[PDB]
Amino acid sequence: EYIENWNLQNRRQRTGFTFHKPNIFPYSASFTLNRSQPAHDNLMGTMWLNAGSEIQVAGFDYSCAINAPANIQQFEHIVPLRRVLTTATITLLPDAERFSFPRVINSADGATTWFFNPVILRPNNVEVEFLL
Amino acid sequence: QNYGINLPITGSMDTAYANSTQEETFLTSTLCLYYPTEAATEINDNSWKDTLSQLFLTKGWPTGSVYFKEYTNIASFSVDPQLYCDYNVVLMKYDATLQLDMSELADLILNEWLCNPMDITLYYYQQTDEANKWISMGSSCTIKVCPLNTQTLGIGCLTTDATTFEEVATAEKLVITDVVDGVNHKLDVTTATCTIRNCKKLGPRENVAVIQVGGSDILDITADPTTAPQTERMMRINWKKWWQVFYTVVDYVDQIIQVMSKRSRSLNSAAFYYRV
Amino acid sequence: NYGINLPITGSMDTAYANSTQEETFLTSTLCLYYPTEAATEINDNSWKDTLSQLFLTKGWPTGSVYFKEYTNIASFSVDPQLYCDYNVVLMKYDATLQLDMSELADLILNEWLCNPMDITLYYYQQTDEANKWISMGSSCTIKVCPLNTQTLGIGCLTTDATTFEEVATAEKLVITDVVDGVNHKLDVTTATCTIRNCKKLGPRENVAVIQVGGSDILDITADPTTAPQTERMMRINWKKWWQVFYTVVDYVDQIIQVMSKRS
Amino acid sequence: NYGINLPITGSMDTAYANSTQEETFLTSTLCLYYPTEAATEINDNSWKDTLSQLFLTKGWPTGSVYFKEYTNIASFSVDPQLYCDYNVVLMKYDATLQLDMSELADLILNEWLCNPMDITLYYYQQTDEANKWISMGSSCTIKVCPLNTQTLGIGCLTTDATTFEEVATAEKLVITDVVDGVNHKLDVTTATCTIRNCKKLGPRENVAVIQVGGSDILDITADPTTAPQTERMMRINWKKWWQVFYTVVDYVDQIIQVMSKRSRSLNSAAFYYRV
Amino acid sequence: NYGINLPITGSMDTAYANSTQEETFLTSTLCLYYPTEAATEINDNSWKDTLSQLFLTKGWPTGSVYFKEYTNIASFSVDPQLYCDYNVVLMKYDATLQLDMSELADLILNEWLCNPMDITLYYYQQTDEANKWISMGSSCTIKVCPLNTQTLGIGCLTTDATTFEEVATAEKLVITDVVDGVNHKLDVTTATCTIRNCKKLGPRENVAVIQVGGSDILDITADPTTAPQTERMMRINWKKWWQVFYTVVDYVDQIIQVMSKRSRSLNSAAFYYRV
Ligand SMILES: *[C@@]1(O)O[C@H](CO)[C@@H](O)[C@H](O)[C@H]1NC(C)=O
Ligand SMILES: CC(=O)N[C@@H]1[C@@H](O)[C@H](O)[C@@H](CO)O[C@H]1O
Ligand SMILES: CC(=O)N[C@@H]1[C@@H](O)[C@H](O)[C@@H](CO)O[C@H]1O
Ligand SMILES: CC(=O)N[C@@H]1[C@@H](O)[C@H](O)[C@@H](CO)O[C@H]1O
Ligand SMILES: [Ca+2]
Numbered sequence A: 001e002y003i004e005n006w007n008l009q010n011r012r013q014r015t016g017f018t019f020h021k022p023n024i025f026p027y028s029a030s031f032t033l034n035r036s037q038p039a040h041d042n043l044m045g046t047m048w049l050n051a052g053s054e055i056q057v058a059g060f061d062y063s064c065a066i067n068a069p070a071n072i073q074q075f076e077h078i079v080p081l082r083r084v085l086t087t088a089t090i091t092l093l094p095d096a097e098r099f100s101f102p103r104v105i106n107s108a109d110g111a112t113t114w115f116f117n118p119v120i121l122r123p124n125n126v127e128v129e130f131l132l
Numbered sequence B: 001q002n003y004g005i006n007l008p009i010t011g012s013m014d015t016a017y018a019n020s021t022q023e024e025t026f027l028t029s030t031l032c033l034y035y036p037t038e039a040a041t042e043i044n045d046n047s048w049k050d051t052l053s054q055l056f057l058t059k060g061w062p063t064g065s066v067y068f069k070e071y072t073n074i075a076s077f078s079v080d081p082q083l084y085c086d087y088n089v090v091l092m093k094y095d096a097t098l099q100l101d102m103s104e105l106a107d108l109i110l111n112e113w114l115c116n117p118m119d120i121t122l123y124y125y126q127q128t129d130e131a132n133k134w135i136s137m138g139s140s141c142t143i144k145v146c147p148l149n150t151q152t153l154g155i156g157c158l159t160t161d162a163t164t165f166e167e168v169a170t171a172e173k174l175v176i177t178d179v180v181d182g183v184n185h186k187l188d189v190t191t192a193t194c195t196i197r198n199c200k201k202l203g204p205r206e207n208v209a210v211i212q213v214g215g216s217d218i219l220d221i222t223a224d225p226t227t228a229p230q231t232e233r234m235m236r237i238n239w240k241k242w243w244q245v246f247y248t249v250v251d252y253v254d255q256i257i258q259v260m261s262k263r264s265r266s267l268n269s270a271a272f273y274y275r276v
Numbered sequence C: 001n002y003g004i005n006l007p008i009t010g011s012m013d014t015a016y017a018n019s020t021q022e023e024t025f026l027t028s029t030l031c032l033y034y035p036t037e038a039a040t041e042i043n044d045n046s047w048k049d050t051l052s053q054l055f056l057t058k059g060w061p062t063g064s065v066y067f068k069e070y071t072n073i074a075s076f077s078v079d080p081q082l083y084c085d086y087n088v089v090l091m092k093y094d095a096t097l098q099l100d101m102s103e104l105a106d107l108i109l110n111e112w113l114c115n116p117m118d119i120t121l122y123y124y125q126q127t128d129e130a131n132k133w134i135s136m137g138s139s140c141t142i143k144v145c146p147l148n149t150q151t152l153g154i155g156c157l158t159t160d161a162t163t164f165e166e167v168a169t170a171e172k173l174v175i176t177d178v179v180d181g182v183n184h185k186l187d188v189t190t191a192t193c194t195i196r197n198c199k200k201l202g203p204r205e206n207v208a209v210i211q212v213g214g215s216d217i218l219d220i221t222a223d224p225t226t227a228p229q230t231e232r233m234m235r236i237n238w239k240k241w242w243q244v245f246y247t248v249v250d251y252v253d254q255i256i257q258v259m260s261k262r263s
Numbered sequence D, E: 001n002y003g004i005n006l007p008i009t010g011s012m013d014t015a016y017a018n019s020t021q022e023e024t025f026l027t028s029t030l031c032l033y034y035p036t037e038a039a040t041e042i043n044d045n046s047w048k049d050t051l052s053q054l055f056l057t058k059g060w061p062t063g064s065v066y067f068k069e070y071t072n073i074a075s076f077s078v079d080p081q082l083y084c085d086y087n088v089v090l091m092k093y094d095a096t097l098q099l100d101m102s103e104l105a106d107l108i109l110n111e112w113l114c115n116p117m118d119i120t121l122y123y124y125q126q127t128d129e130a131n132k133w134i135s136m137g138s139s140c141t142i143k144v145c146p147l148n149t150q151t152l153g154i155g156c157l158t159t160d161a162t163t164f165e166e167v168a169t170a171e172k173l174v175i176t177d178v179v180d181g182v183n184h185k186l187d188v189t190t191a192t193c194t195i196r197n198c199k200k201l202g203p204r205e206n207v208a209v210i211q212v213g214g215s216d217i218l219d220i221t222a223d224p225t226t227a228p229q230t231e232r233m234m235r236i237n238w239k240k241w242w243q244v245f246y247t248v249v250d251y252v253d254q255i256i257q258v259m260s261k262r263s264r265s266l267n268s269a270a271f272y273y274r275v
């Protein structure tokens, strides 16, 4: 496989390598707070883990959309790749099992810590898009 | 540095913690202890403020950093409570008679109220949602509420006769009035000694705690019947001597300061979010 | 309905239905209860008129809100007949009636399957932990003696009614817990009382209790271990009774929310 | 906010709005101040009833416009209190109260951060141009004693109070400017006066000042090089007050384009405490 | 290997043992504590004989359950000595003895380790949060005089005893919290009192408290930010005291399910302050 793609690519013809669970995502584990205060008791934003070939994103809202318009809070998470993939087979499941238990998380600059005690609803109105 | 705008904050979940910084808070900030005026009567001293301030030096606070004030009772403290310094904690006795009035003071100082003036003579009044209350304080408040209809006629009241009005308060130093939300009302505040004020609550206050000295532990800080939470900064301790009450506060400064925080309004970053 | 047989599967990721709270208002009733002195301080004649105009703002129709009263906790508890769709009560806190407010809320908030008792002819034991004896009437004086295997009294005489061991003297409502397994001879005042053999089930969801006054005093269980506070054992503080009714009219969407229908 | 220290980036090709002015009128308040010598000439017990319907035809709803009243510039300077979201002030000019109009307009139109002063016990100084000693009360005479390096006095025996020199006399609002960097000693009559060590901030946004009659003469900046005329300083020539109140209600929108309601202070005070 | 602290490794697949709650009723003992006004209301002598038949139904033998009595909370708290395996004393609520009930449950529900004190020779200080000063006797009157780093009093003279601060007078049990880290001087009237310092190790497992009537007040932790309610705190409401006794005989499995054996009673705790 590798000596055939060595020769096709040396003449400028189209090549291709077939992978099983390719390491396309660099390791990243962080968060984003769209609403915060120094008490850290009314928050909103997303958390994610990108590692290997797996994305687990989870959005939270402490008020549970009590003052949102039509009681709906919108979330979004955009992951750019490094190389263009072709003909992928992707499994999508409606729960982030890693962001489901109570934990304490440091602040953005490492100053203080804040507490996150989740209960989990189902995701409403899911849309996954594949851009080029 | 971009005072008005809201901007999101990102940050990694793998970052080393900072130092302890509980010490440096004691070097800079202030502290106010409040007590009823009969506490100093049992103490029988004119140097016990000097005596306590020697004991706060052990826990890191400097000499001129801790301030002491007085009040007579919670009925006369509540005609004008204003909290000045950075951190403070108030001390109140338990009265079985003053059930609601302990809950009024713990409503007024533990939350944060955005307030607009009112004019009883000129307009007709209503409450918009669940966060709208009518806070009224003064020497002697007496409030009578005449609800109107969609044609501005009285419901149970005559809009000319003030006797057919409907009373919610009698000669109180402070009132927080909850009426039904969405109905125009007609009002009878005795404005010579009282001052009604259209208020609206934001998020609560972070720098004051309340120590309920003695009794049971009941305080309805909220407005509904269906819940009544007991937050972090309201607490209770038993008593026989007011010396032992004061020794417990001086010993456990580091826990009481930990339960409260700095007032988020007081910072620079709230410059157009209502407090520079 | 409810079914212990006949399993119901259902699924997930089905769409949430629309808010049916408004249709719940149009096809239901609501019945408030107040002690008699609450109507005394108000001293209006048409105060039932001026409240029904205010329930109409929140969506309740003009034929669904009913007002009933009682004298005190001692007189309401002779036979509480609660039969509206939704019910809430307003109990004024008395310090010495601390044991009677727990006995009423035990009777109101939970279901009870009851059975008669013949004091003259039979001997009665309690089988279950959830087996209790409820006696109502005008003046209940209950005297209990335990029993050995040989049908002989333990600390009493089965002939002499003076040597018995009483648990109640002249009370309108008594809930009696006795150790389980032992038979008993009873001696009650049957002329002004009616003791029965009731059995506890799950809670009643069409009733709710708003305590009006001092602190939480509610052990509606029988063991000393647990004393829970559920969704609808709530409490306020008062200075004027006319202010208390404004809070109930305003926050109907939270009081109706923590309770269910008869079905 | 927790995150002011980030940059914001916007394009120079985006689209405008539909002009959000009617949303400003419906969800805001307005408090116009006036001296008590208006209401004698006004001669009505329903002119608050009258004018509040004339604000309806501009877009303001009923329960939004409030009217409040003082008696002169002297008795308003004791405690200026701003209550609602918008505040326009009507004041009348004379020749004698010349400094006292610039004193009042400085405190109102600018934000201040005031600490208190224990003048009996300690010796105080001013650290740059931007702090002043703002004292207010019923009546207080202030006398100052500059000191040298060695705590000795210059031109003033530090024990005698009659050797001190005078800077105020029975004034309701005093803003003192002394030499920045010299330790002093004070003689405020503290029984009727509260002096405060206080620092200037950015200008207060929402409040506007309209003077009635007389020329445009106001010094807000402490230095004599600069005497600026900001966008919230106006003047109107008067003969009757009914022309004045009609002029304000007819040109509400020109005044709203200037004041910017984002700066409410949640309190009713005119300064900040040691916050 | 009596004093060595070796770890243990156990699996997560071991099958459970049998029920065991009917063997504990055979071997162990039980003690009841009631105020002496109980037997006044009972009007019986054979009620000790009566109830011992009722414990036999639930599984206890005839010689296991012991009955002890006291007069009031004040006189029981002079020296509470609790000897049997499982101890259950129910106290009566008093609105005025609110601190004295919670000082009793601080002793009983926890376990203290105590060192003696000599007031005449030495000056005392408390090292951390666990050090409290437990004094009990016929009449205890404790006076404190804090000292600086030079052995001089702060607000007190070390020669005059009237200037001393006062924390209690004429009680049967006093638990005293002072500022941790300051040398003090004491004035306990040790003719009828006996003070010794103690530090809290952990909870005393084999004893429960059943409050009889009244609201929920109890504060173990002499700490304002913490007032925990453990599982061995119970409250019931009373009208008669037969119904109290049928309740505790009925639910003996639930009283004993929430309290274990005393960890210091075992032969395991050999050199870890046994019993
Ligand atoms: C603190 O001294 O040390 C930390 C690492 O040991 C360091 O991150 C931080 O800068 C220091 N903070 C201060 C100023 O005390
Ligand atoms: C009033 C309301 O909430 N709107 C819903 C709407 O969302 C829904 O699509 C429609 C059909 O079910 O029924 C309406 O009642
Ligand atoms: C002149 C103008 O801008 N018109 C648009 C109007 O057509 C649009 O429907 C409205 C929606 O908010 O916004 C306005 O800005
Ligand atoms: C529950 C079970 O089957 N286990 C047995 C039990 O039946 C038996 O009574 C007991 C005697 O000690 O020994 C257990 O292992
Ligand atoms: Ca009426």
Ligand SMILES: [Ca+2]
Pocket: B127, B129, B130, B132, B178, B179, B180, B181, C250
């Ligand atoms: Ca309301």
Ligand SMILES: [Ca+2]
Pocket: C155, C156, C163, C164, C165, E044
């Ligand atoms: Ca007997």
Ligand SMILES: [Ca+2]
Pocket: C126, C128, C129, C131, C177, C178, C179, C180, E250
């Ligand atoms: Ca039973």
Ligand SMILES: [Ca+2]
Pocket: D155, D156, D163, D164, D165
């Ligand atoms: Ca001179």
Ligand SMILES: [Ca+2]
Pocket: D126, D128, D129, D131, D177, D178, D179, D180
């Ligand atoms: Ca200067």
Ligand SMILES: [Ca+2]
Pocket: B045, E155, E156, E163, E164, E165
């Ligand atoms: Ca002294």
Ligand SMILES: [Ca+2]
Pocket: B251, E126, E128, E129, E131, E177, E178, E179, E180
């Ligand atoms: Ca201590």
